[PDB]
Structures are given as structure tokens and as C-alpha cells.
Amino acid sequence: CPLMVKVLDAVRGSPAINVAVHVFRKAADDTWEPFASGKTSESGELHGLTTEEEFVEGIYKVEIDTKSYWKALGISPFHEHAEVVFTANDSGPRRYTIAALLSPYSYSTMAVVTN
């Protein structure tokens, strides 16, 4: 699969489990259309979001529901959600891993694009 999302918790030093993730694709009319979604696994990963056939060039948004994650742990967070917005280009490199490292008032996100 061409798109994987990984979410980690910097407060507890753990995968961020059962985090809701929504992927959207930008439509011609510039609105965001649901594309795929899921919850992270026990390893903080969400696999299986799409297939090579379905994941065509375009602008995509990954929304990670960090607020709900923190609230279920009893912790007061700053953000409503985390967002990752990027163009998929299949000129060269074919697999995208979108990683997010969560803290209450900060987050870091990285993209690893390989093979």
C-alpha cells in the first residue's frame, strides 16, 4: 500500500492507539472529499487506507484527531486536530509514510517517501 500513517505519543513514549485518521482528496471545486479513514492499531499504525489504483496524483489532506486522543487519556490539549496536506506525485517514489509525533501543545510530522 502506497499510504501509511504512524502516530506516536511523546507524553507516554508509546504508539498512539485508536486515533481516528481521515484522509481527504481535493476536488476540482477546491473542496475536501472523503477518501479513506481508520483508527490506528496497537502499534500506532494505520495500513490499508488505499490501493495503488485508487491513489492517483492530487492534493490530499490527512486529519488526525489528536483532541479526542488526549481527552480519552485525561489530558488537556491545544489543537483540534493535526493536519498533513501534500501533493501525491508519481514521477518517481511510490510509497508514502506520514508520521506524527504528538504532544499536548506541539506536534512534529514527517513524510518518508520511498522505493
Added chain:
Amino acid sequence: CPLMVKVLDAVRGSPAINVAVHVFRKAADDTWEPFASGKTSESGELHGLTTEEEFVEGIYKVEIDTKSYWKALGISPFHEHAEVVFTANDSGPRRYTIAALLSPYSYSTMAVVTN
């Protein structure tokens, strides 16, 4: 100034100068309404976006135009922009500094909130 934005460039070890920033506020009908915009100075800072009177409670989105930054520097980055989405002023007025540390395939953002 209740809202300040600070942007740094992790490739150069410097302020990220001339970075466009657009702030949106969610309206009663749930769409993102333009609220304020500006660009970072030579110190990577953006002051003057709003006033304590205008910066009412709401859900705000700070969009940092990182792709246009990397490309005005001749570089092809991953993200379209860096987004910071948060509820503001729901326990009374606060001052928010939204900071972002930029790399071509990653960024970190953090919020300092003071009363």
C-alpha cells in the same frame, strides 16, 4: 498582540523570512472564513495580525505557506502548507505564539499560550 507567528528554517539555521501566513476562523455555518494574513519579517516573526477586540472566541486555523517559501528558495518540498487548528479564548483572552520549524519533508509546530 494576542496572536504572533514565528517561523524558523532548519536547513539554513535562520529565521524563515517572507513566509506568507493566512488565518481563518470557523463561522457559524461551519466554513473557514478569512480572518487575517501577513508575512514573516527578517526575524521570522509576524506581529500585528489581530487585536484583542477582534480576536474573539472561536476555532482558528493558522495556515503557514511553507511550499511557497521553499519554492521561492528554489526547493521542491513535501507539504502544501503547515496548519495549526485550535480553539482560542474559550477561558477568556489569552496570548498565543504559534511557532513552526521547517524542513523540506517535515515540520514541527508548538504553541505558547500565556495569560
